[PDB]
Amino acid sequence: KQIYKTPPIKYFGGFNFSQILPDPSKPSKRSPIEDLLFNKVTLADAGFIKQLICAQKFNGLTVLPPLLTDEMIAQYTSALLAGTITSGWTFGAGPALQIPFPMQMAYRFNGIGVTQNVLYENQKLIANQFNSAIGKIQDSLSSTPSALGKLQDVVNHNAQALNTLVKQLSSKFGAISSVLNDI
């Protein structure tokens, strides 16, 4: 309901969230993993105004732009991240209530049948493992051959359908010629 903002100074007992939180240095204010995902996927016509194949579609085939620009979606994602890393899950019901992160992780272990002393005695090791996993996931995403298969396929299918529809114009259909003017 309300766009939360991240705390000014970032420290959470050892966990390194700098790989998912927004980066003010970049012009678009997007997390590094979001930047990698954006660079991985390829697009031709995004619906922006530009008065080769994309410009050829003047036979009535137009692409309208989405209502939500791909700049406030990042704001929604950042709000969700801040709410879920600061106030636990309590912001899903009413007003958000502050709670320190180790206590949240203690709750989360208590919720799967593990007593809470485990984390209060293995905090450092758990933090190191979490940081290592977060570090490795970016390399796995970057060096994999093609992991974004689904989005690429859904992008390609529409382009293929539009190309077939455009190419269908130059067919005689049993007539003398495919040009409406010469006839």
Binding site: P65, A82, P100
Partner: protein, 176 residues
């Protein structure tokens, strides 16, 4: 009417190669996008004239009758107007990522979206004394939290609420 290639459009100068035997241009859907001049042997590029669709942004006929008009991807000043075009060819012409908006202001404020337009732009019928404004979509009030190493916020009261929900289950049968 170049040698019988009857058509309509704008002719410009192109940088195509067009080896001496070649004299036509072609692409998908059998559209001649270039042509060699029969007399001066100059190559020309053919482009279709400006065209598009229009949309009408109105509140209900009950509330009022003032409307605004949106032209799809025209970039306004390029070719806004060449009867129905009595709208002053002006009156706060505004430009957006979706097209040319005629008949609405642009308030610096922010409210909730009423009539979606596109690319993060909305419109409404606020009262300044009646006009149509085109603001920027507001995602809600920004809120802060006070994370600290030792702090909890435990509620002291509660509330019981009732929320409705509506779901279709079936549709009318028919036979033909």
């Amino acid at each position: 009417n170049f040698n019988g290639l009857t058509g309509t459009g704008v002719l410009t100068e192109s940088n195509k190669k067009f080896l001496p035997f070649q004299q036509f241009g072609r692409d998908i859907a059998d559209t001649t996008d270039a042509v060699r001049d029969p007399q001066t042997l100059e190559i020309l590029d053919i482009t279709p004239c400006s065209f598009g669709g229009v949309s009408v942004i109105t509140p209900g006929t009950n509330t009022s009758n003032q409307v605004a008009v949106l032209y799809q991807g025209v970039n306004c000043t390029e070719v806004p107007v060449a009867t129905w075009r009595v709208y002053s060819t002006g009156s706060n012409v505004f430009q957006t990522r979706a097209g040319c908006l005629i008949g609405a202001e642009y308030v610096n404020n922010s409210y909730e979206c009423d009539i979606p337009i596109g690319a993060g732009i909305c419109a409404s019928y606020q009262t300044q004394s009646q006009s149509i404004i085109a603001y920027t979509m507001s995602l809600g009030a920004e809120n802060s939290v006070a994370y600290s190493n030792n702090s909890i916020a435990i509620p002291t009261n509660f509330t019981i609420s009732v929320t409705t929900e509506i779901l279709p289950v079936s549709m009318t049968k028919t036979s033909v």
